Structures are given as C-alpha cells and as structure tokens.
Amino acid sequence: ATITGAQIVARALKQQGVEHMFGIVGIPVIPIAAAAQREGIKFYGFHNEQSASYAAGAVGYLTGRPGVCLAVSGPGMIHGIAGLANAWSNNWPMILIGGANDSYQNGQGAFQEAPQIESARPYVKYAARPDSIARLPFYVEQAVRTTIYGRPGAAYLDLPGDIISGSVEEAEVTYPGRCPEPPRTLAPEENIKAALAALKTAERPLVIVGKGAAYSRAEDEVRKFVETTGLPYLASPMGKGVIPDDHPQSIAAARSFALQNTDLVVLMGARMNWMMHFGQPPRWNEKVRVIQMDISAEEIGTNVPTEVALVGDAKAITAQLNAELEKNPWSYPSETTWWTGLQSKIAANAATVEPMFNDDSVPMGYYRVLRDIRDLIPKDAIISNEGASTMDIGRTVLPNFFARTRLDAATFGTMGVGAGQAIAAASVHPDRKIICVQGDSAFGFGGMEVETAARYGLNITFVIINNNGIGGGPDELDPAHIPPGAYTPQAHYEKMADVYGGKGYFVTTPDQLKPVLEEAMAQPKPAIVNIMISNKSGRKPQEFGWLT
Amino acid sequence: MATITGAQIVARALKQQGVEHMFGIVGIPVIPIAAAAQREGIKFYGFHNEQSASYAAGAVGYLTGRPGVCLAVSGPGMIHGIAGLANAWSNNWPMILIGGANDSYQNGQGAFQEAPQIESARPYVKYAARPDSIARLPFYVEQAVRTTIYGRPGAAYLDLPGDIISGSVEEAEVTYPGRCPEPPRTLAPEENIKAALAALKTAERPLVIVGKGAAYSRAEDEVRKFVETTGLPYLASPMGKGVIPDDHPQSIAAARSFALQNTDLVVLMGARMNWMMHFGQPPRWNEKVRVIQMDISAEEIGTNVPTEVALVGDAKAITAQLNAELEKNPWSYPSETTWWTGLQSKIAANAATVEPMFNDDSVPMGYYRVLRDIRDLIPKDAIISNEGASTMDIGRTVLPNFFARTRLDAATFGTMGVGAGQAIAAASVHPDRKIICVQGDSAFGFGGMEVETAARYGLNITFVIINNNGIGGGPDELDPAHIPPGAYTPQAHYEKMADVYGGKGYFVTTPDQLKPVLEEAMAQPKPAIVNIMISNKSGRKPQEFGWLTR
Amino acid sequence: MATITGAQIVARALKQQGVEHMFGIVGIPVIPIAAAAQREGIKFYGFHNEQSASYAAGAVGYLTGRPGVCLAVSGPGMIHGIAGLANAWSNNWPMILIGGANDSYQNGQGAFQEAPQIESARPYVKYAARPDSIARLPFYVEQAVRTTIYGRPGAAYLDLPGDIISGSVEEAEVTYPGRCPEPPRTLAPEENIKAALAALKTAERPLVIVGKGAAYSRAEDEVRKFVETTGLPYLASPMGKGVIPDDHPQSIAAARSFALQNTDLVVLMGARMNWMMHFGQPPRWNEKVRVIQMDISAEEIGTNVPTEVALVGDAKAITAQLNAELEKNPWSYPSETTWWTGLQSKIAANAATVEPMFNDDSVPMGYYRVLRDIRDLIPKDAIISNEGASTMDIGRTVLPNFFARTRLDAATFGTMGVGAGQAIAAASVHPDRKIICVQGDSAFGFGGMEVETAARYGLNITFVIINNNGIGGGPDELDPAHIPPGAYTPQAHYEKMADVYGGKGYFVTTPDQLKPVLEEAMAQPKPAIVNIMISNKSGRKPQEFGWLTR
Ligand SMILES: Nc1ncnc2c1ncn2[C@@H]1O[C@H](COP(=O)(O)OP(=O)(O)O)[C@@H](O)[C@H]1O
Ligand SMILES: Nc1ncnc2c1ncn2[C@@H]1O[C@H](COP(=O)(O)OP(=O)(O)O)[C@@H](O)[C@H]1O
Ligand SMILES: Nc1ncnc2c1ncn2[C@@H]1O[C@H](COP(=O)(O)OP(=O)(O)O)[C@@H](O)[C@H]1O
Ligand SMILES: Cc1ncc(C[n+]2csc(CCOP(=O)(O)OP(=O)(O)O)c2C)c(N)n1
Ligand SMILES: Cc1ncc(C[n+]2csc(CCOP(=O)(O)OP(=O)(O)O)c2C)c(N)n1
Ligand SMILES: Cc1ncc(C[n+]2csc(CCOP(=O)(O)OP(=O)(O)O)c2C)c(N)n1
Ligand SMILES: [Ca+2]
Ligand SMILES: [Ca+2]
Ligand SMILES: [Ca+2]
C-alpha cells in the first residue's frame, strides 16, 4: 500500500492540530488541498495569496496553533511572503507551504523556479525543503513546534513538485505525535517580589495590557491582578478585551496624560516599540520605571531600561503575582491625586467627543457613523477594523468585552489584512458574528475576498467608511491632476455584493445608519455597507500625533 | 563643549557593558577602535589571522557568560571573522564581531573593501546592525551585548563605516545606557518539576547526561548535588566534563555505548539530541527511550525524539527546583541494581582493554602512552585546549576535568582552527591558571602562527602536538607523484616555530623523553612547543559503533 | 551494468571541463572526492587552512581563464573558503568552491556540521546550487564552470551532501556534457570604435590605463600594438603591470599623480574607476575629464564619472578593432608636446628622489635598498607574489614585470592572506618558472604555515619577508602592559619555519648579506625563507596625495 507526499503532509498537518488552510491551488499544490479536505482540514480558496497569507497569521493569534497558507511555486509563494512578515512583526504562529518546481529540473529554468527559501528567510523562524517523501512528517512537526514554542513566529516549507506527487510505502513513514502545548515558563521568585515591592513605592503606577497577554490566554489572571491591586490600566489596540473595555479602572480616555506622567509601568505582554512611543520623552517621563513581562528575553530593556524583568509566559507569571499578593496583600488607594488627575482627563475628553457622537451633519463624521455601528455589534462578536482614521477612531469607539475579539493592522500597520482576518475569525468562530469595518482604501486591498466569504457561507458583514481616498479625497476629480491618494468620488463598492448575489447598501444620511446596519447584519449572505463621510472629519485633537 | 570620536564612544560603551578583552587585527578603518579600547583599559590582542581571533572571542563567551569581542577590518577582515560567528552560532555562545566598513558616502563607488557584510553575517547571528549615527553608538552596543546573552545565547555583528569611526560629535549629545545585567534565571512550572522526578522513579535504567549548557549556566554545584542526592548514573558530554569531577564514582563514561543503548529514561541537562548524542535514535538508543529535557531554548524541546517532561529555563535554577523538590519528597536510585551491575561490568571491561595501551613503550609511540604522561603531569586545575580527530577524541576520554568549563575542543561544529585561539581565550580569562594545548599535527597547522601571539602577550600556554604525519596519519616518506591528500611532510619539526619568538621547542620520539621534556616545557617562561611523534597505525579503543552516526 | 559513485562522477566531470588543479583540505564528507580527483589525473594540494586554499583557487582563475577549484568539508571548512569566494567576487575571477554538506536525510536533526552554506556563499557568487541527485552531477558541474567564465567572470559554489558523494548509480544513466568552450570574444559597434579614436584626436593630454581586465583577456599583444601605434602615454594598474613591459619608454608610471590630475581624456582598458583609480573624481582627477571605457561588463560603464565612448566587450577583440581601424585611418600622438615634456619632467624628478634610497647602506635597512637587490636578482620571467602594505606598494613600483599576468598582489579587495596561496597557484600553473613571494612580516603571518605546503609539493617558490616588527612597523622592545595593536615580537625569526620541512632559513640585517643570501636561497631545492629586517621608520616616496582617497 502506497501513499503520496501530498497525503503524507495533509495527514501530518491534521495530526499536528492544523484545522484551517487558506490559499490558492495550482501547479504543483493541487493534490495537497485535495488531501487536506479528505483529512478534515477546511480549505478556503482565496482570490489572492496575499490575503490568504494574512488570514493564516490571524488564525495563529486566535488559536495558539499555526494557520497554514498554501501557495503555488514562484509568484504564488512570493505573494504569501506578506503573511510571513506580518506574522513575524506580531510574533504570530503561521506556516506558509509553498510549492516548488520538480527537484530534477533545478538549474534548467523550470516552471516558476525561484529561490523561495532565501525569500522567506528574513521573516521565518524556520525554513526547510524536505529532503525526501518519507521524512515529510518530521518537517511538519518541527515546523509546527517552532512556530508555537518560544517566541511564536512564522515558518516556511518548500515542497518540490516531485515530493508532492511521488509515492512511498506507508510502512516507510513514521508520524510523530501531536506537538503538545509548550510549558508556561515562570519568572524567578526574587523578581516577583521585587515587582510588587516597586509597585508599593510608585506614586503614579500604571498597567499596560498588550496582545501578548491575549495570546497567552491570560485574561483571567490579568483581570484578577488589576482588580486585586486596584491599579489603573491601559489596553493596547489589540490588547483591549482582555479586561472588558467598560471596566472602571480603564484610563483609555486619558492615554496621553497617563503615559506622560506615570512613574512605574507594568508591560503585560506589550512592547516598548513604536506603538508605545519607545517609552521615551516627550510621550513618557525621562525617569519612568519599567516592570516588563514578556516571553522573549531579548525584548527586555529595549529603548528604555527595565528595572524588574519578568521573562516567561504571561499567564504563568501573572499567576505568580496573584499568589504572592495572596500571601502579602496590597492594593493601590482609590483616592489619590493620580486618580483625580486621571478621572479629570477622562471627563474632559468625554465631553469633547460627546457632541461628535450626536453631530448629524451631512456628509457625516467618523464619530456619528461609528456610534450606530457600536450600538449594533453583539458583545461576543469579532471586530476586524482596518484603515487609518477608520481604524484609529474605531479603536476608541468600538469596545471589546472578551480577549482576542479585535483584529486590526497590528504592529506592522498593514493594509490588506481586513477581509482575510475576518475570514480567519469566521473559520475559528463559526457561531459568532464577524463585523469587518474598513476604510475605503483598506477595502480595495482585498475587496475581491467578499466573494470568498460568501462562497463559504461565513457570517461576515462588511462595512466601508468612505471619504473618497487615503485619508480623504475630493468630491470631484480633475482628470489632469488626480491626487495620488484619491479614488473615484462616491465609488459604489457595495455593488460588489451583486457579484455573489448579496445585498449592498449605500449610506449618506444619519437616518439610514441604524436600519441599514441592522438589516445588513441579518442577511444570510455577506452584505456590504458603503458609508460616505466628509473628507474633513477627523479624530479627537491631541497634543501629540501617534507617529513619534 | 568637548567632542568625542565614534571610536572613543564605542570603546567607552564596550567598557561599560563589561567588555575586558578584544581580539583581532587592526587596519583601515578600525585602527582608532583598538587604540581607544586600550585607552579605556580593554586588553587588545593582535592575532595573525582574524579566523583564529574570531574563534577566541566565542570561547570567551562560553567561559564568562559575557560576549567576547572580535575586531576586524572591512571586507576580507570581517569575512575571515565569519568563521567565529558560525562557531558561536553552532554552540550558542555569546560573541560580537565588530567589522569595519568603507565610508558611507563612498557606497556604490567601488570603495576600498566595499562588501555586503551585514548579509554575510546574517545566517549565523541573532543581531546584525549598522549604527545609523555616531550619537546612537551606545544604543547599538548595549543592544548587541544584551542580545548575545539574553535568551538562547548567540552571536552578533556591528557594521561600522569608517566615517562613523573617525567622525566626532559633542559629548553632551551622547547617552550611555547602563551596564546590561545578567538575564533572569528562568524557572520551570512546579508541575513539570514533580512530573520529571515522578518519571525518574518509574525508570529501571535511568541515565543523566550533563552537557555544556549546564556548564555555561554555572550550574555545577546544583548539578553535582542533584546527581549525588539521586544517586543516578551520569554521562558527561565532551565539554560537559568537569561540571561533575570526572573521577566521580557515579560516572559511566567508560560504558558510554552500553548506557545509551539500554537506558529507558534519560535526563538531558543542557545537552542536545544532535549528532553528538546520535539524534537519540536507534541503533545507538532504544526506540522507546523516554526523555526529560532541560534546555533554555523551548524550540529545542522534542527535536528528533519526543520529550516526556519538558524543563524549559535556566539549568541552575531548574536544577535547584529539582533539588528543592527532592528535599521535600526524598528519593534516590538504589546502589544495588542490575543496571549498576551491567554498567560496572562494562566499565571494568573497557578499563582492562586500554590498561596495557597506557604502558606500551613501543616506538613509534601510541596515543594512550603519550596521553598518559600528559594526564599525570597536568596541574589539576589546568585548562585544556584539545583539538584534532583521534588526538581530541582519545584525549577526551584520557584527560580528565575536575572543574566546570576547563575543556575547550572542536565542540558542536567540529571545527579545526580553534585550538590556539581558545587557549589564548582561556589564558586571557584565567591568568592565574596553566593552559595546556593538545593538538594533532593537522589541527596545529590551521592556526600555528598564533603561538607567537601567545608568547607576545606572555600567556601561560604550553603547546603539545601529537604528530602522525597527517590527517589521521601519513606515511614515513612521500611519493612526489602520489602524495595522499591528508598527508604532510614526514617528521615535520613544528617545534622549531618556538624559535620564532625565542621559546624552546622539543622533538620527542621515545617514551623515556616524555616526562622530563613535558616537565621542563611546562615550566618555561615562554610558550614551549612539544612535537611528539606517534605511529600512523595508532588508534582509539575499538568500538561496536563509530562516532559518526549515518 | 557497472556503478559509479557521486565522487567519481564529480571528479570525471571536473576533468572533462578542463580542471587540472584542486586545492583544499579533506575530511568528512569530501574524502572520496579528492581521492577520485587524483585517480582522474587532477593534482590535489592539501593546504593547512581552507582560507589560503580558496585564495589559491581564485588566482588560478585569473592566470588561466578557467575556474580554480577549492574543496572544503562541511560547515566550518566551507565557511573558511568564503574568503576566497569574496576575493574572486571583488576581482571578477573564475573559481568554484566545492563544499561538502551533511547527509540530506539528516537535515533538521542537528547533523554533523549542518549549516546554511548556500546562503552563506550567496552574496559573493554568480551561481550557487545543491545538486538534486547523483545522476545530474555533470549538469551542475558544467553549469557552474560555464557561469564562472561566461560574461563577467566570477565565483560559484557547489553544495554536495554526503549521501550524494558516497551514493552510487549505474553508469548508463549518467550523461556527461561536452567540455565548456571558451566564450565568444564580443565586439563593440564599429561606430563606437570610430568615436573612440576620433575622441583621442581631440585630446591635448590623453592617457591610456592598462588594467588586469586586459591581462585576463590575454590581450597583451593587441594592447602593446595599440599603444605603440598611437604613441600614447600609458599607465599600468598594479596587476596591469606586464601587459606592456614595465621598461617600455611610453610608461608614465613614475609620474602617476601628475598624469591623472592633468589628463583630459583617458582610455580605460580593462580597469575600473574604483578606489584604485580614486573614483575618477577630483582632486586626483580633473573634474572635466573625458573617459573612453573598455569593459566586458556593461553595468560597469559610467560608474562614478560619465563615459563619453563606451566599448563594451572583450578587451582583446575590441583592441583588435581599434588596431584594425587605425590601419585603415592612420593616426598617432606626436612625440613632441608639452604633455610629454611635463610627464618626462615629473618622471626625472621622482627618479632623482628615490635614486639615493636604492643605494643607502644604513642599518636597519630601508625598503628601496632591500628591493633593489630583489629586483636585480629575480629571473626576468619570474612570477611575483607581492603582499603587505608598504612592502607591496613600494614593491609595486620597484619590481618590474615584463610579461602579462606575472604579478599577484592583494588586488581589488586589498586582502591580507593571499600571498602564499597565490604563489602556490602560480607554481601549479607555471611549473617551469621561478616564483618569488615578497611579503611583509604581518602578511606572512596570515598564511605562514603554507610554506610547508609549497615544500611538500616541490614547488619552486622562494619566500622573502620584509620585517619591520609589525603592521607598518613595531618597536624594538615590547612593553608588556602597552603592546601596540599592530606590533609583533621584535626580531621574529620567521626563517626558522624553513626548518619545519628541512629547508634553509636566512636572517638578514646588513646590506652585505643581501646578494649572497638571495642567490643561495633562490637556488635551494626546498623553498627557502629569507627574513630581512628593515627599519620601522622606512617608508615610500613622499606624495602629495595618499593612496586612500577619502
Ligand atoms: N505566551 C506569552 N507570554 C508572554 N509574552 C508573550 C507571549 N507570547 C508573546 N509574548 C510577547 O508579547 C509581546 C507583544 O508585544 P506587542 O505585539 O507590541 O503588544 P501590543 O502591540 O499589543 O502592544 C511580544 O514582545 C512577545 O514577545
Ligand atoms: N543558561 C542556560 N540554561 C539552560 N540551558 C542552556 C543555557 N544556555 C544554553 N543552554 C542550552 O544548552 C544546550 C547545549 O547543547 P549542546 O551544545 O549540544 O551541549 P553538548 O554539546 O555538551 O551536548 C543548548 O541547546 C542551549 O539551548
Ligand atoms: N575578457 C574581458 N574583456 C574585457 N574586460 C574584461 C574581461 N574580463 C574582465 N573584464 C573587466 O575588467 C575590469 C577589471 O577592473 P579592475 O579589476 O579594477 O582592474 P585593475 O584593478 O587592474 O584596475 C572588470 O571591471 C571586468 O569587468
Ligand atoms: C500594505 C500597505 N500599503 C499602504 C499603507 C499605507 N496606508 C495606511 S492607511 C492607508 C489607507 C487609508 O485610507 P482608508 O483605509 O480609506 O482610511 P481613512 O481615510 O478613514 O483614514 C494606507 C494606504 C499601509 N499601511 N500598508
Ligand atoms: C575547518 C575544518 N576543516 C577541516 C576539517 C576536517 N578535519 C577533521 S579532523 C582534521 C584533522 C585530523 O588530523 P590531526 O588533527 O592531526 O589528528 P589525528 O586524528 O591525526 O590525531 C581535519 C582536517 C574540520 N573539521 N574543520
Ligand atoms: C584580511 C585582512 N586583514 C587585515 C588587513 C589590514 N592590513 C592591511 S596591510 C596589513 C599588514 C601590513 O604589514 P606588513 O604586511 O608587515 O607590511 P609593511 O607595511 O609593514 O611593510 C594589514 C593587517 C587586510 N588588508 N586584510
Ligand atoms: Ca478613506
Ligand atoms: Ca594527525
Ligand atoms: Ca610590517
């Protein structure tokens, strides 16, 4: 009895916990997608490997197991490099399976012959071309384990066409057991005590909850830590939901004031990178003290020195903090000038955005549109929010009540992930509603994938906030001097719903928002809501821009 | 106010980060770097080839837990140093290669020694960076140092253009980070600690393997207490020798092939299941062997063979967890089992086989007769640089180590060319110790010129060459039309190289010369070279399996 | 029928492709490759370090127009050989590095010397490939050879796993390509030939520069006929020396800085406007200089300075076009111009400055006094391996070359470590010639062990060391607490290294020793080593500009 290399890899992937595969078929990976379906792996055929590679990385973040992207040789694999880099930037587990020309045709100028290993090298923790068919399960298990052990990351498997279509005896093939979950590593006890001792000396302490705690499934231990200590906390863009965004101790409406004045910050799975302004002045105080919790030891002390390094798993380390807090109880006083200054800043920004929510001007503004979107999103729904102002204002206006329920451009600030991450969320959570909120430019990067979501019957609603271009476009286009960031004025993107027989809606006035969004979200097929806004609407004014 | 050059900034930053030694060769454009380093108190060693200097930097990283620094000129100087980057990459040792580069405003012009040096170092480094400006040089130095010692230790590369080295900025606009502290010693979950000890109590033929990862973690005291308390048989890796003294009664080194082939549960303390351990696979292991793996690299867990209990973290801290759990729940392996009896029987058989080889006075001499006098005259706390094939492999079993991190060999990469460089690195780290360099005649040739480097800097090194006329032996006379590829000049008098620097060189052929020559040579104020001729038929003890599993 | 191993296939394919020499060091897994190569008639040279062996392979490529082959073991052996790949990359010389690799079925296991060797060689090679199967080995060998010599010549790398080397296939399923013929000598458009000659007739101060690209193209006869017919002044690049005999009356080598600074039109015959020619930019050139560029690489045209007439193609064929067009439309530069007068005046001034330096009998001696006796005793057709800084730069101007491709120096990459390797390469290519190796004391240390390699293979090489106690000089006594970074042991007796292989070593300090020592040394049946001490204050002739433009 024989078995093909495609049937070996599909059986090895399924045994290693792979349940979702995204990509596009063709020479030579056609039998791999067929064998994947026979093993129970759900395969999603995309319209471009770029979006499919982004969807695989989102699965790794949502599940702790690598999403798999399948691509053909040459240009197909290169399109999927975008997913490798995005998973590399966010430390997400992901595997790109790229076909390759037959091994005995190397050097001949074979069909789509390309240096695919060296192309994937800068963004992968692991890259391998399996030497033989019988050893395929070795490479599948080693790639899966490398993506999820240590600091999570991406891997690339280079499959020549003759390894895929060739056959061996089943008795030759050894299959490793399913890769167990890695051990949740602890921090030394003297560091746990030093972290709590430093918190007792702080006058203006602050907790920052990043998506590292979300990936670590640490939402329970993190909330118990914040509530026991009574510390004010700031959630990162994709860290919101780990603690419900309606929590009384959130200081999200005073973000700039909190970062600028805190004297001790606890980074719970969050990097002091561009998203946190490198922890440097003027966005921070020059003498801010840092307690850093991260599984990557190399990340400790980046840009600003770390006083207490907590290297290890976020859930296990936070469990250490809560256990020591039970032995020596401590909590931050609820009546301090730090709290008074924080709440005073929260009330000032609350009154600033209050009239924006109730502004019925036409063309509409961001806050008026997102208010009706916010009030219709189910509490357990997954939010795919992409764009510039559409994503930034949606970050503050759209709350998350559970961890790992927001997917945005993330660390790499990538446009082109919206529809793919929405499809990834739908595959992981088939019992939930997926709300995709994109800017008009962000929608164009992968707009064809709305047919992909409809083809597989995914419960996704596509909302487009349109201001006629990248950060806005004019109402009329001078055909001689077209602004480089502008698109066709009032482009009817909702008409793309007619491609697959869905319902598209065009919205310009505030009275349409609530009935259109409610009706579109109840459609059996994915609906597209195209909402026009003024090219002059913007976020709440700030002392500092987000790009330091 | 006052200004400062990039070279002086780099030297000051390196000194703040704990760098005391710098090995390399000067030239355009890194001359002021070595000058400023000596001005700061950093001892610079001028080698004869950057290849040997880069190997020395990686050995300093293993011996100290702090990155050894190699300084190389642009182009071919940095490329010569990639060998050391790759060797530190293979052994997970901390080191920094500081390579000069052509002036940035001359890129694309065909500048002097213009080369893609970042991309050349990329496959073997955890961190490669060209500092963008002179003022941010301390940022890159601290980031490189921290990346080499945090997490799984490894190599890094700093690409310094000439204008960044020779240019100047005001001192007021330069910020120096604090000295990078040692990384936290990571613990394993207490459930895994109990699971590892509970698995040991189910094993009928358990085995402990002590690797050089436990040596790098400075975990010798915890590793010894663990093996003594449990009473378990233990095997030392080639550079794991010394963590527990090699004369320990629980060592089964003389029954290595038997222990690996019959153990049912092995505890890997800082050692990989790579080519050295035959991938943990049959026929060298049992196909159902259970593994307790202790490693700082989570990605290493489960390689080749599955791991039953994973102990991810620092060896010293995790071994302290095992010892603490043993004091709470005592247990020890019995001293009277059939496992001990089979191990002791195999030890006595291999001891009887090699016993007459130690006393064979035949000329040309054999490995065991020569290594016997080296073993018995070496200071008990000396540091051994052992390199070659049979010279290193037989020297591994014959020459014992009683302290951790006192043996330096070809290591995981099996590299020829590290012998003299690692001996120089050991001397620079331990100036109060005697360094013994035991190389085969071929391995000595890879970096033989560096004997003058050791003499120039007054290092307490004694060079011993075990010469069989080539790579694994060569004939006594050479056919000019049929010279074997691995042969050298018969009776090559390498000891005459001691006359280059005014040292003494010895030529040994008969056993009556061994003891008086080695005694006088080791007492010389200059590095002596003892060229000992051996038979080209001499080889190691016969084994059922070769060391290279394939 | 009969079977054949991959090693025997590689050796047979290399022999068919014209490979006669193979330099390197054997070991796992490339032992049968060197054995099969010797079985085929390929002469194998066992070096002491692959670094020097890889430099030797590139020198063979320059001397023959056919790729020199370097054989290296897996891991660190191949990484040592990257230095030669980079040197061939910098000089556009054909060479192949054949590096072994671990067994393919052991990838990912931590196999012996497992390393990303393709990616390590990538930045410096035109072609890197791991043969997919044993039967297709001749395909990869011919493709590698052809890629090294077709187009702009360069380096290539072949990654051979151990199982591909030791495995066997039937001979019937192996196809061997024909011997790769020499590439066609490409012509320039006849409109560009006329445009180049018409531009020459408008120049008031024209200059011809002969580079080693014209030497590689075997274009010496056409280049000499071109310069003689036109009567133009010509300057020879460092390794362009010998294309036209250096005693030619039209050479303006003694007025180099004046010629470059005042020429209004230059003809580049196989020479780049890189760091050697100071990028063709002021202050070393006039900002309005016109350029006629002759190069096989179209991408090189117009680098740094614009090219008025582009002559893309083979130097020999294009120079033959210029000579053919000159016979059809005769022209020559007049022998009586102010340009000639200024050049001749500058030559006589520099000759008068260095004339007493040649005759200075002061002790410690100077460069010019020592190089005078080397120049006057060298055989007129000898091949010179000159390496170092001042030793190489002054030796470039003092030691003349009368035949093309008879000087081998640090070349474009300015590499230290090529001296002995290139001397061995020259001897292997020209066994009927005397090879003279003139190195500084520092450059000798980079590959000093290879003197035994030259002696073991009976090569007619004489090693001369110009010793000033370090890199650019060192003190007479060393302060143990303040050793300069570029200093070595004072009065280091490197000549004692000749006693390693039974040769004769000489120590020279006074001028009365120069002539009798050099005469006796060059007549020795074994490679002699002449260690000549010079003053640490001796330097080259004073110049207005330094050689390093920055
Ligand atoms: N299981 C885990 N436990 C702890 N930290 C983790 C874990 N997984 C990833 N991390 C770390 O969390 C950090 C996330 O940083 P970042 O993505 O910048 O957060 P955010 O963007 O939400 O601020 C990464 O540095 C990563 O090393
Ligand atoms: N501080 C540390 N604590 C625990 N393990 C470590 C530490 N530093 C390195 N290691 C691990 O030790 C292992 C050493 O394995 P190896 O070099 O194969 O040892 P040997 O060659 O002696 O068998 C590496 O895999 C490395 O991840
Ligand atoms: N057969 C050939 N015909 C013409 N030009 C060639 C040939 N082979 C190589 N070249 C060119 O000659 C040039 C040599 O330049 P370079 O090495 O800088 O010479 P030098 O160092 O002597 O100035 C290279 O740019 C190369 O492209
Ligand atoms: C791959 C990629 N290409 C380009 C960009 C730059 N970029 C950031 S936001 C954006 C589009 C902004 O327009 P839109 O999404 O419609 O948002 P809004 O106008 O509401 O801000 C672009 C092109 C990017 N981040 N990623
Ligand atoms: C950089 C490098 N080049 C080549 C080799 C191959 N190699 C392994 S051992 C050895 C030399 C063996 O001879 P010697 O050191 O004299 O020891 P002996 O076995 O003869 O005692 C060589 C060249 C290597 N391991 N590393
Ligand atoms: C591979 C490499 N390492 C280092 C250098 C830097 N370098 C240039 S010349 C030189 C040695 C100069 O001394 P020596 O050869 O003795 O000549 P001298 O100038 O003293 O006559 C060195 C180390 C280099 N060019 N290449
Ligand atoms: Ca927009
Ligand atoms: Ca030997
Ligand atoms: Ca010198």
Numbering used by the authors:
A (entry chain B): 2 to 549
B (entry chain A), C (entry chain A): 1 to 550
Quote the passages of the study that discuss this structure, keeping the authors' original sentences.
One such enzyme is 2-hydroxyacyl-CoA lyase/synthase (HACL/S), which catalyzes the reversible cleavage of 2-hydroxyacyl-CoA (2hcCoA) into formyl-CoA (fCoA) and an aldehyde or ketone. Originally identified in the mammalian α-oxidation pathway of 3-methyl-branched fatty acids, HACL/S has demonstrated remarkable catalytic reversibility, as it is capable of condensing fCoA with various substrates covering a wide range of aldehydes and ketones with different carbon chain lengths. All the enzymes are tetramers, specifically dimers of dimers (α2), where α2 dimer represents a catalytical unit. The three domains have specific functions: the N-terminal domain binds the pyrimidine of ThDP (PYR), the middle domain has a regulatory function (R) and binds ADP, and the C-terminal domain binds the pyrophosphoryl group (PP) of ThDP.
TbHACL/S was co-crystallized in the presence of fCoA and hCoA. On the other hand, the asymmetric units of CoA compound-TbHACL/S complex contain only two slightly different monomers (protein chains A and B), each protomer from two separate catalytic pairs (AA’ and BB’, a prime indicates symmetry related partner), which means each catalytic dimer is formed by the structurally identical monomers. However, in the tetramer, the two dimers are slightly different, but contain identical catalytic sites. Several residues engage in close contacts with acyl-CoA (R545, K546, Q548, and W552 in ApbHACL/S and R540, K541, Q543 and W547 in TbHACL/S) through electrostatic, hydrogen bonds and van der Waals interactions. The C-terminal covering regions are coming from the second protomer. These contacts seem stabilizing and augmenting cofactor interactions with the active site, likely extending the “on” state of the acyl-CoA. ApbHACL/S has stronger activity on C2 (acetaldehyde) compared to C1 (formaldehyde) and C3 (propionaldehyde) substrates, while TbHACL/S discriminates less harshly between substrate chain length. Structures of both TbHACL/S and ApbHACL/S with and without acyl-CoA indicate that there is no notable difference in main chains and side chains except for the well-ordered C-terminal regions.
